[PDB]
């Protein structure tokens, strides 16, 4: 039953490859449905942002080597924006999956019960985030693409100097 979603990535407009995720819909269904729909764009316009609820053309705006890569801010591209398909944010659904390995997909937030559209992919274990961020999926292919994102040189806000853009995205 678990859905599979993908991003086709470019780095400074140069295709880097495809990342495929499996989403743990059995554990975190509301969280997974949000991400799935942001991949397809099927839910249309975000209520507060008035921009498409869609990861197409969205950046990975924050990268920290040996920690994680973060993206999904479709409205501002810098971490300040984003919103969920439900309007505004939604509650933390489950803390059952641990941040105990690389290549886990988890929600970025701005505190308790503030899940929007922003996510991160771990590149090392991040156990201190347990109870703070909801893990809801995992990379199943394209790990090397994630590593290439992780290796980008970044600015003072940890934003890559070279644009890491989701060219295309969807559900498999």
């Amino acid at each position: 039953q678990r859905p599979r979603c993908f991003f086709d990535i470019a780095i400074n407009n140069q295709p880097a490859g495809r990342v495929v995720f499996e989403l743990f819909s059995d554990v975190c269904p509301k969280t997974c449905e949000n991400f799935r729909c942001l991949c397809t764009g099927e839910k249309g316009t975000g209520k507060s942002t008035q921009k498409p609820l869609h990861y197409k053309s969205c950046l990975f705006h924050r990268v920290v080597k040996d920690f994680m890569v973060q993206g999904g801010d479709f409205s501002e591209g810098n971490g300040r924006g984003g919103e969920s398909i439900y309007g505004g944010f939604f509650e933390d659904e489950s803390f059952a999956v641990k941040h105990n390995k690389e290549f886990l997909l988890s929600m970025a937030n701005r505190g308790k019960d503030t899940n929007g559209s922003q996510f991160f992919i771990t590149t090392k274990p991040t156990p201190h985030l347990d109870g703070h961020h909801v893990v809801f999926g995992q990379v199943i292919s394209g790990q090397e693409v994630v590593r290439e994102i992780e290796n980008q040189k970044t600015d003072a806000a940890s934003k890559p100097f070279a644009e890491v853009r989701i060219l295309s995205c969807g559900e498999l």
């Binding site: 971490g79 984003g82 937030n109 701005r110 929007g116």
Partner: peptide, 11 residues
């Protein structure tokens, strides 16, 4: 430090 926030990134 090592957080993943959306708006005020901390140490």
């Amino acid at each position: 430090x090592l957080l993943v926030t959306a708006g005020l990134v901390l140490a």
